[PDB]
Design a protein around this ligand. Structure first.
Ligand SMILES: [K+]
Ligand SMILES: [Mg+2]
Ligand SMILES: [Zn+2]
Lengths: 165, 159, 96, 174, 92
RNA sequence: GGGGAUCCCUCGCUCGCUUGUCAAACUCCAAACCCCCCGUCAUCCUAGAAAGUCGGAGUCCGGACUGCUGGGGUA
RNA sequence: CCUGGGGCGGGACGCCCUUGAAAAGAUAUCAAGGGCGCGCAAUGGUUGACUCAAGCGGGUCGGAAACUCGCUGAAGAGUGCAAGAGCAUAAGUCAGCCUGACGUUAUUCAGCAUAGCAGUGGAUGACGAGACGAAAGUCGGCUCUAGCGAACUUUUGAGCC
RNA sequence: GAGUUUGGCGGCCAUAGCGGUAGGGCAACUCCUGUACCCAUCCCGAACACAGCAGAUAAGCCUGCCCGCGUUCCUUACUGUACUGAAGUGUGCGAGCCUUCGGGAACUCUGGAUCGCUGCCAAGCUCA
């Protein structure tokens, strides 16, 4: 039971400024995911962004199950099944930042809205990572049960045929 | 201001600089002299004080200067290694009125050393043992305590 | 100047050792003492309720009654007999 | 992760993630026996535990495996089994002589209609005094096993056999 | 600091928790027929008046907020020991 | 981040492994004295323990030696 | 008034913490470090759910300054404000419901060791009503120790004389 | 009736921690499979919750081992050293220090051990 299944897939849009643009970004992200998105809040006021503490900045959504698989396949198609080594984490996680939301069918470009980019992260776990997430008897999984970069790329090839350059 | 003022140890330590204000910086610049990247010096002599005393940073600097001059002149620029082992951690203060609110202001730093404690260690070759001995004798003349030289390594290499 | 609070000079008296900081063993909070039993006063700093004065830290008291959760102890302080109230978290039976 | 002498390691039961010592302290201050209801994925278990300086002592113990002799063939790890185990635990504790306690669910989440509260209702309905509020109990139909209508036709016999097991378990302590 | 104008608390008279309205207490004018006023007028003559020629003292840096809690059911008020605040408002 | 368009190359702090030093208001450690309690011996005690009540006070300028590196101070 | 004469300066003139202080307690100086004369209907109570600081790696002009993912992380954070102490399935963070920041009352501590002394303050209880919670519990404010004042007088509250 | 495997609750709270290595599951636990339902997500059946036919010991868990860091205990040297209670017509110009009787470290070193011990109950089992 060492096949690195997909624990979850996360889509995040770091707009950096709240308001009408934030609502448009969250609506387009919810459309492209088919699931309610949640607003991310800043943590330190900065005159560069002119924002304050605890104020909406971006949005992200967690996808698990066949929804995650379908979104991951679409997102990998937008990069044409391509993902290089430097994308991967030290423990089997990847992420890559696309620019045009127009590449997801079912949404139309708006002159008012513009085009918002986003970053997608899929976290690769193993079958049994509930040990570090359940409430009772929660133990950290050993280092021999984690996922390596080469294991992750082999899984991606044997599961999606997403070659790694 | 003679060294006999802040010489005897009658008091507890005064070293926590976050609870004091404005300590003058120490005069002692270097603590390692000669060839610092050499460890295969066979003979190693040290200067140990034989009384419990406080040595001011200026006295330490004077002793270090005189010993370093003698060593550089006799053994050469890299014919020796010299280490000043103790740092001046104690803060010396003076009451500068009379005895009202007499808790002093910080005027310097001193090293509080114990009897038989090493102050300076010098490592040299076999042929420079007497020169190192002479240099450490001159250094001890600048210190507020009687001193004695001891051979730590290579006793059989001198006699 | 110098104060006269209860927590006067309690830096190490009311401090815990490094590996006993945190939630204390809960068995000490549900121990029962009989009348006339001799118990030590060893204050637990983490239990901030029902704590006797630190002046009685290190004293052995005799249990003379109970006042709810707490125990009433007769504790000798110099030449006086003081009535000290303590939760069992701060108490400890004397062993013979 | 003992980095050094100043590192503090938690209690062993806390390191294992099996006990909450703050909750345990709150429960021990009752000075009453705790009705300890624990559930695994395949069955449910109830204990009557009193504290000792040397360690906990158990007074009474019922497990889901005991129901199968009384005529229960359903899954031991659902609401009907939990209720039946609670009933057997309460009746057995009454037979022993112990008749009071408080509910100790430990780290288990407190959710209305849970298996833990079905076991609690089984304990209550046996006459075993234990404080509680009725709004956390499961509906009587799903204690009878109305969830059998979900996917399984074979599960459709759960209500009558639950009644039969209940009557036999009452008869054993009647 | 702010306190709600109305909140539920204990009524000492009806002996239950009811809604109570908080009202600031205004100091009244001293009666001219009290025994101290009559004594002041009686000790008034020629010369020093004793304690009646004392000038009033100073003030603390902050005074307490004198509040009165009237039950909405029995319409009786009770006043409790009160805090000491520079700025006091009612939460509405 | 200090020095004289590919930031063409020089490197102070910062983080570790060894070296050398420290702490009234630091402690992973840790005494000897001492303190509460229990037992023991010892001493006192029915020629009155411990406890209690009441009468009369003086006294609240102290000083010294031996230690505590007592604190302050050049002393 | 204190005061290394007095005065000038200052307040060691009330309260709280660390050291001095010599491992019980006590312990002085115009001894050292200082702080307080407040702030807060939430910055309070309770329950649930979570876990902090800081690093490392991944992620788009979203820069090595934002947000997000993973790993490490007994706490290196936060807990209103001094200092010290306490706290991690929390005493921290967020959310739901709330007002116990409740009326009355008894002891014992400690200001004031031993060992008398006040206004107070703080622990444990009782009575009467509640909030949260399955319950156990917790809650007499804000983790513990500062934020305050006699008699007389007036004014205010409830019922009486 | 004695022991074992597993499960639950614990006591002491690192001798138990961090790290590495090799073995097991018939029952039990677990990962694991779903989301009609009770219950849930500031989004996500991830969690919690419910209902569970399969697959699996790769994890948790258990057993064996490893001194690697951390911890705890012993041993040798330091050393009866540092410090210290009592006394002293012992001693120093002095800051001080000594002798006797009684207590007595810490660190480091030599060589070892320490990779938890343990209480109650239950259930499977292994019996004369
Ligand atoms: K004078
Ligand atoms: Mg005067
Ligand atoms: Zn009323």
């Amino acid at each position: 039971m060492r096949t690195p299944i997909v624990e979850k897939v996360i889509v995040h849009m770091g707009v950096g400024e709240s308001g009408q643009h934030l609502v448009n970004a969250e609506d387009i992200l919810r459309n492209i995911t088919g699931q309610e998105v949640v607003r991310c809040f800043a943590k330190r006021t900065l005159p560069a962004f002119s924002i304050k503490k605890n104020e909406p900045i971006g949005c992200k959504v967690t996808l698990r199950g066949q929804k995650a698989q379908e979104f991951l396949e679409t997102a990998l198609g937008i990069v044409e099944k391509t993902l290089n080594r430097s994308q991967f984490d030290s423990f089997g996680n990847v992420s890559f930042g696309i620019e045009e939301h127009t590449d997801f069918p079912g949404m139309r470009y708006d002159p008012n809205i513009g085009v918002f980019g986003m970053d997608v992260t899929v976290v690769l776990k193993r079958p049994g990572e509930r040990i570090c997430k359940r409430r009772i008897a929660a133990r950290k999984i050993p280092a021999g049960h984690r996922v390596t970069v080469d294991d992750a790329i082999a899984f991606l090839n044997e599961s999606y045929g997403v070659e790694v350059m | 201001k003679p060294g006999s003022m802040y010489r005897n140890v009658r008091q507890r330590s005064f070293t926590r600089r976050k609870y004091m204000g404005g300590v003058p910086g120490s005069q002692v610049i270097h603590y390692d002299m000669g060839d610092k990247a050499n460890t295969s010096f066979p003979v190693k002599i040290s200067l140990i004080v034989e009384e419990k005393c406080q040595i001011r940073h200026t006295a330490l600097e004077a002793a270090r200067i005189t010993a370093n001059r003698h060593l550089v002149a006799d053994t050469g620029k890299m014919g020796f290694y010299m280490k000043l082992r103790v740092y001046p951690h104690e803060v010396i203060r003076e009451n500068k009125s009379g005895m009202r609110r007499a808790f002093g202001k910080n005027v310097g730093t001193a090293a509080r050393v114990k009897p038989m404690q090493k102050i300076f260690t010098v490592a040299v070759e076999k042929q420079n043992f007497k020169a190192a001995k002479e240099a450490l004798w001159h250094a001890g003349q600048k210190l507020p305590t009687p001193c004695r030289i001891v051979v730590d390594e290579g006793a059989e290499l001198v006699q | 100047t110098n104060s006269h609070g209860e927590k006067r000079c309690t830096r190490y008296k009311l401090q815990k050792t490094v590996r006993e900081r945190g939630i204390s063993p809960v068995s000490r909070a549900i121990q029962e003492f009989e009348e006339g039993q001799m118990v030590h006063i060893d204050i637990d700093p983490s239990v901030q309720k029902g704590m006797p004065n630190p002046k009685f830290q290190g004293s052995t008291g005799k249990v003379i009654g109970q006042r709810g959760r707490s125990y009433v102890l007769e504790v000798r302080s110099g030449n006086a007999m003081k009535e000290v109230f303590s939760l069992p978290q701060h108490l400890k039976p004397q062993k013979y | 992760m003992a980095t050094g002498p100043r590192y503090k390691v938690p209690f062993r039961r806390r390191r294992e993630g099996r006990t909450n010592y703050h909750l345990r302290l709150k429960l021990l201050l009752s000075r009453q026996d705790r009705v300890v209801v624990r559930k695994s994925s395949r069955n449910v278990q109830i204990q009557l535990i009193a504290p000792t300086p040397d360690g906990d002592i158990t007074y009474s113990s019922a497990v889901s495996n005991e129901l199968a002799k009384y005529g229960y063939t359903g899954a031991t790890g659902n609401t009907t089994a939990a209720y039946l185990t609670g009933l057997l635990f309460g009746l057995k504790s009454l037979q022993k002589g112990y008749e009071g306690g408080i509910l100790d669910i430990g780290l288990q989440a407190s959710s209305a209609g849970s298996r833990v509260y079905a076991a609690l209702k089984g304990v209550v309905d046996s006459g075993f005094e234990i404080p509680c509020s009725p709004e956390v109990f499961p509906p009587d139909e799903r204690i009878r096993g109305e969830h059998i209508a979900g996917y399984r036709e074979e599960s459709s016999d759960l209500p009558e056999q639950f009644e039969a097991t209940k009557e036999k378990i009452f008869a054993e302590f009647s | 600091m702010k306190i709600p104008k109305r909140f539920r608390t204990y009524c000492p008279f009806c002996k239950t928790h009811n809604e109570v309205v908080v009202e600031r207490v205004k100091k009244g004018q001293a009666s001219s027929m009290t025994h101290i006023a009559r004594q002041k007028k009686r000790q008034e003559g020629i010369g020093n008046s004793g304690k009646f020629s004392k000038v009033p003292g100073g003030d603390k840096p902050t005074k307490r907020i004198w509040l009165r809690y009237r039950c909405t059911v029995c319409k009786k008020a009770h006043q409790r020991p009160c805090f000491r605040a520079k700025k006091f408002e009612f939460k509405e």
